């Protein structure tokens, strides 16, 4: 909107074409990550970590 | 961020500001009663024995 | 429940107990007798009350 648009002009930020879906730790629960598993569709290239 | 200064402001917004406490099978009107909140460490609600 | 068991144990009297028969000016020195270990909590006693 107009006032958001002025905001971007002053602080010169490029607003991404992407929205943040990241999985973040549920509120208040705190622990140690003891494992990670990565399942990938058959046919998509496995990433680095995976 | 739970900045340390916010806890004191919370005591302000709490001071005179009742909260409603309610129990499960609300039967008579006393099933909901107002209390003055007192800030408590811990995840438990404390309830005056007489009530 | 707990509260009424306290007051019941508080105002109650056995037949013979520390301080039996003595007299005290007022509730104040009655408590002074009890907390200090001189007199038993329940003993028949005359005390001045207003």
């Amino acid at each position: 909107t107009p006032e958001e648009k002025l905001l971007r002009a002053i602080f010169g930020e490029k607003a991404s074409d992407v929205k943040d879906s990241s999985l973040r730790v549920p509120n208040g629960v705190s622990g140690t990550v003891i494992d990670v598993q990565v399942f990938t569709r058959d046919g998509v290239e496995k990433d680095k970590r995976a | 961020r739970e900045e340390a200064v916010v806890w004191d402001i919370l005591d302000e917004v709490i001071r005179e500001h009742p909260v409603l406490l309610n129990r499960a099978p609300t039967l008579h009107r006393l099933g909901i009663q107002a209390f003055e909140p007192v800030l408590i460490e811990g995840k438990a609600i404390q309830l005056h024995p007489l009530v | 429940q707990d509260v009424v068991l306290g007051l019941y144990y508080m105002t109650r009297d056995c037949v013979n107990a520390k301080g039996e028969g003595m007299v005290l000016t007022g509730p104040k020195e009655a408590e002074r007798l009890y907390r200090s270990g001189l007199a038993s909590l329940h003993a028949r006693v005359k005390v001045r009350i207003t």
């Binding site: 208040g28 629960v29 | 811990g42 995840k43 438990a44 | 270990g37 909590l41």
Partner: protein
């Protein structure tokens, strides 16, 4: 059988002892029953429910 095992225990049959309030350091009138009761922690734990 239980009181007799308490005899081998070196402990009274009553199953009650003298206890002192940790605050006043003073005694407790009457014996209180002390012993070892097996206790389970059910998982209703408050930081699930809250």
């Amino acid at each position: 059988e239980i009181k007799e095992l308490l005899k081998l225990g070196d402990l009274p049959t009553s199953g009650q002892i003298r206890l002192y309030d940790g605050r006043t350091g003073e005694q407790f009138e009457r014996p209180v029953t002390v012993g070892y009761m097996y206790m389970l922690k059910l998982n209703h734990l408050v930081d699930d429910k809250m």
